[PDB]
Amino acid sequence: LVPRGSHMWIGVISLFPEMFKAITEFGVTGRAVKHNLLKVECWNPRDFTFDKHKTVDDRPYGGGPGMLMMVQPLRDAIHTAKAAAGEGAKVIYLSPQGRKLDQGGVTELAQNQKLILVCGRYEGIDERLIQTEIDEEWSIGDYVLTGGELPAMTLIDAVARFIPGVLSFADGLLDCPHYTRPEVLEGLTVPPVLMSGHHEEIRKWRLKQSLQRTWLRRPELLEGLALTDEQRKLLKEAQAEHNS
Amino acid sequence: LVPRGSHMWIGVISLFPEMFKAITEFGVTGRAVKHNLLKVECWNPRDFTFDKHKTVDDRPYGGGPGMLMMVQPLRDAIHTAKAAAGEGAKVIYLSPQGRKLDQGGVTELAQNQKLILVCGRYEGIDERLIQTEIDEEWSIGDYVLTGGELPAMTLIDAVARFIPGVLSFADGLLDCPHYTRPEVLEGLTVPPVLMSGHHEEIRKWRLKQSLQRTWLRRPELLEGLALTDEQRKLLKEAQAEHNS
Ligand SMILES: CN(C)c1cccc(CNc2ccc(C(N)=O)cn2)c1
Ligand SMILES: CN(C)c1cccc(CNc2ccc(C(N)=O)cn2)c1
The missing domain is CATH 3.40.1280.10 (SPOUT methyltransferase, trefoil knot domain)
Structure with a gap:
């Protein structure tokens, strides 16, 4: 069946x-x-x-x-x-x-x-x-x-x-961080965007985090990719914030 | 115990x-x-x-x-x-x-x-x-x-x-091929050196095979190594025989 x-x-x-x-x-x-x-x-x-x-x-x-x-x-x-x-x-x-x-x-x-x-x-x-x-x-x-x-x-x-x-993974990047209950865990809070209900803002945040994580942990994986316009932008933003 | x-x-x-x-x-x-x-x-x-x-x-x-x-x-x-x-x-x-x-x-x-x-x-x-x-x-x-x-x-x-x-593995190389009984398997014979009882010749053959295998299958692994004098020689020999 x-x-x-x-x-x-x-x-x-x-x-x-x-x-x-x-x-x-x-x-x-x-x-x-x-x-x-x-x-x-x-x-x-x-x-x-x-x-x-x-x-x-x-x-x-x-x-x-x-x-x-x-x-x-x-x-x-x-x-x-x-x-x-x-x-x-x-x-x-x-x-x-x-x-x-x-x-x-x-x-x-x-x-x-x-x-x-x-x-x-x-x-x-x-x-x-x-x-x-x-x-x-x-x-x-x-x-x-x-x-x-x-x-x-x-x-x-x-x-x-x-x-x-x-x-x-599907896009050749490492995954973003994920969070579940409780809202506060040993003083660490959930990123406000994830509890905003704004699906587009959440998607972009997750993608940006995936790009940042891949860059920091496995930069060679990025060399194997042809990043989209959006990915190039979000990666640049993440890198700028790291040097800031 | x-x-x-x-x-x-x-x-x-x-x-x-x-x-x-x-x-x-x-x-x-x-x-x-x-x-x-x-x-x-x-x-x-x-x-x-x-x-x-x-x-x-x-x-x-x-x-x-x-x-x-x-x-x-x-x-x-x-x-x-x-x-x-x-x-x-x-x-x-x-x-x-x-x-x-x-x-x-x-x-x-x-x-x-x-x-x-x-x-x-x-x-x-x-x-x-x-x-x-x-x-x-x-x-x-x-x-x-x-x-x-x-x-x-x-x-x-x-x-x-x-x-x-x-x-x-211990030396950062891929392993050599190994053989066991029978002496002939579907027309394929065991390398004569392995049945020669000459321990030094057998060691060098195995090392040469390991170098050749690593070069052919995983050449990047060789870049990570500082080859010994002997390994440099045997690898050169294997490469020469491949281009010959
Ligand atoms: C985001 N995600 C799907 C996920 C995240 C964490 C763990 C798991 C459990 N699966 C694993 C674990 C390890 C490996 C490995 N390559 O060591 C492969 N799969 C899945
Ligand atoms: C020469 N040798 C010790 C050996 C040769 C072949 C198989 C095995 C069995 N062990 C394995 C098998 C696969 C992997 C892997 N990385 O996929 C790791 N270990 C050992």
Whole structure:
């Protein structure tokens, strides 16, 4: 009954599929799953092992302190996910060596109706599997985590927001400050304009604050933008008041 | 019995504390928790409400489509976490408007023995709470998620790796490719040097590959580095071979 149509299917390859309950069972993403706007399906390489101890790691050629994902169980899990996905599924590997995710990249990834996310553990996966099985390698940021599961979940959450029905950044700026009750909090008052009921004055104040915040915190983000006439004016005003 | 000492305590304020099972119950972080190297303690603003329906959101002054976290339950939850933490706990708010996390920032945050992480939902929290309760505002990347929980979990995982006992980036470079069995995979062979047993040749090959990979994928990362004599040489060699 809930209108889908732009529903999204996401296959996940992970040694710890139960981690994905954090997004499939709670909040907005949990609702998206319940309403069939989002489907997350997990395959565990451990289920594709054949030895008694269900071995899923293997030693790197050339030595070193780390292990890699064992090729055969991982490869078989990926092939099974691909078979379930059918035609048109893009296979994504999350790693610190990948293309850096930003909101633009999220909107690009969100254009896919089917994704398969491969979650590496240990020191990652065999380079030849990346060559033969992986379409795109992405990073959620310049830091190292214990597995690709949190990055995969982060990507799912980010793209889920663009699925119709699931739900100032949209303009490439940081957001303005927001206020709610009470009118006075530890001596700090709400900006009078927000309680004026003057919608146009409130819009312009918020936009001016967003411009000022972006300039002060992330000035490089401004360089990437072609500001509107109005934005140029409000930013100039904010900068003048800062130097005043 | 497991040596701790540099153990870390992390308080979390979240409307969905059960999401944090994804890190406290599984993998390396799950082991860290079991071994008392890492403690994660959650407070839910819903438990600090007094009305019949346990209301945790509130309307923004000045209108708009979104809601904010209700101040009183959130504020009381934060104060309770602070009381439990005692002296010296840094309070962190995760938002897209915060300082961008990278590995350097992770190592800085990891110097804290106590952290409190505040997870915003809806359109975030009252600006005056950020002023009065929050020490530092951090972002895990330039994208928007449905809540601060995945960013909080991402930060916990990243900093947990620096807790002694819990466990090429360390040099500011991307990692080299790695290989494991089989020797031939879909016609693709393992680089002969990795099966040569010549440790010095293998080290230099890996370093050269890391330099080449960083140059090709993330050249800006190289600008931030003062390369060693050896790194300058191997990078020059890799670049020469690319133009050859
Ligand atoms: C070489 N190595 C340690 C490694 C290689 C691949 C995957 C993993 C799993 N960890 C991840 C994955 C992604 C990210 C990210 N920033 O998107 C951070 N951590 C580790
Ligand atoms: C204004 N707004 C929508 C908002 C404001 C604050 C928090 C939140 C919760 N969502 C988050 C949190 C952090 C990150 C990050 N990149 O670290 C991404 N999403 C949303």
